[PDB]
Design a binder for this molecule. Structure first.
Ligand SMILES: [Ca+2]
Ligand SMILES: [Ca+2]
Ligand SMILES: [Ca+2]
Ligand SMILES: [Ca+2]
Ligand SMILES: [Ca+2]
Ligand SMILES: [Ca+2]
Lengths: 116, 115, 116, 115
């Protein structure tokens, strides 16, 4: 509920389906610890990554496996992945939607931040 | 010199070459008057569209023929074209670079306005 | 239902609320005729522009009044509007979502086309 | 010469000036080894990062310090930075231009790969 990932395909004009997403959180020792992972549905959305209880203050990295996505469609893309890094919940709990728009040599990422 | 157009291809990661661009100026009766046109170069850029003396304040439209570009590469596009509409404002010395990043079902346009 | 407009604000990371949207359709005489209009809700979405019956084959222009949006937030933007022009329903009826991401000197537009 | 970074500001419609950029190369043990760095120029560009002889095939990360850029302009940003990660592949003569278009809650990156 508090963290949602949405992925679109700018070549097909469709949701980007079956995109792997890995979420990390910066530990006290300054390393990235595994936080959550999943894959986008037929709507291009990934719900259920985390809960309000687990999604504490921190620096999060959302790694979107754009390379595996493009290669499964028989295409050779430029990027290894799309990485989104942000501080979460510094002024109290929020809801974060990370949107990504994918092309083989280009991506954009947008954060929609709402107060529940 | 005061108006430049740059077009990139997000699918091939390249300049968008030989893309037709038409510039219109809005006339007093609200119609679009042809003003300038050309084809992007091997660098995806279109220089020499106009001059300081000709590029007066007003509303301009830059139409980029994205549909023809995608058809020439064998790729199915969504838009008829990309239309960028803006007011040229004299407020001190200015150069307008209109940049467009093209995908079959998406484009982005950005104005880089420098002194 | 067949045509939906979604608008985001890249400065605030929020839906772009109260954005005026004018839809035109190219007439037989090659002029733009008024087709539909509305404004984005608190979610940044505009539903109810048209019906499956009215939304026939044609060339449509979706004009998003980005200038009025930015000026209402006391900001002077570059563009007059964001214009999206496309051929609709050439291979039969589809559902079109036109998404726009707005910044004062930049916008992006994405079409998501689905088969109902 | 073979790797160039260009950064634009979507809020002010300008080159993104004095933006710190760090380039890392992935080492055999999967860590990120410092490779190159600099500050974008008055044109939003960072030239001279590396040479043909030094820029071998491998996985590179380009980190753009977007958070510092927005703070210096008095604007509240979302991301800690913009990270662009890619494999450099020799397949014939190539120049990589990494372009980034920055907004407070959004960025776009594009690779322009030319001969
Ligand atoms: Ca878990
Ligand atoms: Ca001028
Ligand atoms: Ca002339
Ligand atoms: Ca009506
Ligand atoms: Ca090289
Ligand atoms: Ca060096």
């Amino acid at each position: 509920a508090p963290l949602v990932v949405k992925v679109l395909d700018a070549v097909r004009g469709s949701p980007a389906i079956n995109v792997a997403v890995h979420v990390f959180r910066k530990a006290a020792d300054d390393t990235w610890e595994p936080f959550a992972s999943g894959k986008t549905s037929e709507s291009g959305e990934l719900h259920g990554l985390t809960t309000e209880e687990e999604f504490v203050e921190g620096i999060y990295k959302v790694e979107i496996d754009t390379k595996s996505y493009w290669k499964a469609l028989g295409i050779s893309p430029f990027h290894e992945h799309a990485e989104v890094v942000f501080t979460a919940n510094d002024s109290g709990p929020r809801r974060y939607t990370i949107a990504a728009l994918l092309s083989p040599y280009s991506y954009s990422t947008t954060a929609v931040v709402t107060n529940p």
